Amino acid sequence: NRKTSCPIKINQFEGHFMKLQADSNYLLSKEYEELKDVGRNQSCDIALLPENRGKNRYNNILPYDATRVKLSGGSDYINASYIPGNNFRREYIVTQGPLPGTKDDFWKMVWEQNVHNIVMVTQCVEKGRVKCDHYWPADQDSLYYGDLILQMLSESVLPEWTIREFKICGEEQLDAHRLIRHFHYTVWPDHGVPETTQSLIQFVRTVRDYINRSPGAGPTVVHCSAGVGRTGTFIALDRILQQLDSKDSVDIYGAVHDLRLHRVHMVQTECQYVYLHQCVRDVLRARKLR
Numbered sequence: 001n002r003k004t005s006c007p008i009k010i011n012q013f014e015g016h017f018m019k020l021q022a023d024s025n026y027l028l029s030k031e032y033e034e035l036k037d038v039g040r041n042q043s044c045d046i047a048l049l050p051e052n053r054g055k056n057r058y059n060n061i062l063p064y065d066a067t068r069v070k071l072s073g074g075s076d077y078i079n080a081s082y083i084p085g086n087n088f089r090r091e092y093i094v095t096q097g098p099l100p101g102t103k104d105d106f107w108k109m110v111w112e113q114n115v116h117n118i119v120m121v122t123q124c125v126e127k128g129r130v131k132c133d134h135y136w137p138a139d140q141d142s143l144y145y146g147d148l149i150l151q152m153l154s155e156s157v158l159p160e161w162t163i164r165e166f167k168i169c170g171e172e173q174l175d176a177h178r179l180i181r182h183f184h185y186t187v188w189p190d191h192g193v194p195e196t197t198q199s200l201i202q203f204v205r206t207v208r209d210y211i212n213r214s215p216g217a218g219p220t221v222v223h224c225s226a227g228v229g230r231t232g233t234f235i236a237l238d239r240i241l242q243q244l245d246s247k248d249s250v251d252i253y254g255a256v257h258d259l260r261l262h263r264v265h266m267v268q269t270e271c272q273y274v275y276l277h278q279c280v281r282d283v284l285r286a287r288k289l290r
């Protein structure tokens with residue numbers, strides 16, 4: 001029944017988005033609402049098993065069975081979902097903020113899934129509430145995490161994000177040792193989206209640049225506290241900005257639709273949906289004049 005895609009010619013985008021926003025977002029809200037049930041036929045039965053409650057930060061925010069990431073061994077559960085790319089599977093892994101009791105699991109998944117890049121879009125504490133464990137080392141002294149050894153090589157604080165590099169080694173499969181880059185966006189507001197489009201556009205472009213210069217990146221891990229709206233907004237913006245560099249139409253609706261198929265709450269508020277439109281708007285406004 002419902003639309004899976006709403007492509008807009010770039011030359012029409014400014015007017016499209018104005019029309020969507022007219023009459024207090026009348027049409028924007030109607031469009032957003034058409035996405036409401038996408039993916040929602042899918043079960044999370046494994047995530048709900050009695051063994052796994054402690055492994056979920058939030059008991060009501062769970063991976064679908066069909067797209068969950070599995071750990072090797074006798075207890076395969078982690079709160080994490082695969083997101084396919086346009087050209088190949090497993091472009092992204094979306095996950096929750098690791099718990100003290102799941103941080104070893106997190107690094108095991110990183111190792112086993114050949115991940116080279118992690119994007120974190122939450123602070124560890126927000127508004128007095130714990131949102132994520134500090135699941136990486138506090139300094140440059142090496143530490144075991146389960147069967148893995150980790151050592152932080154650098155930690156670089158920038159105005160709106162912090163970039164860390166780690167050495168990691170686990171049981172040898174496709175590699176025997178690895179460098180991990182971690183991109184920590186530190187300024188997402190406590191309720192609402194970033195104040196500027198520029199900030200997240202530049203964060204997404206920076207991460208994408210680092211990924212693209214890797215000889216082999218693996219899936220990119222993206223997490224907030226729950227692996228929900230902020231993470232989905234990040235990934236959607238990555239897709240949308242690449243679209244603007246390749247095609248003469250942009251499909252924000254489709255980008256969000258595609259994410260919702262694979263995990264609950266991928267772009268979770270109308271405000272995030274609006275923000276994605278504002279980002280596209282602003283890029284196109286600039287380009288029109290250059």
Ligand SMILES: [Cl-]
Pocket residue numbers: 082083084085089090091
């Ligand atoms: Cl996939």
Ligand SMILES: [Cl-]
Pocket residue numbers: 084085086087088089091
């Ligand atoms: Cl791809």
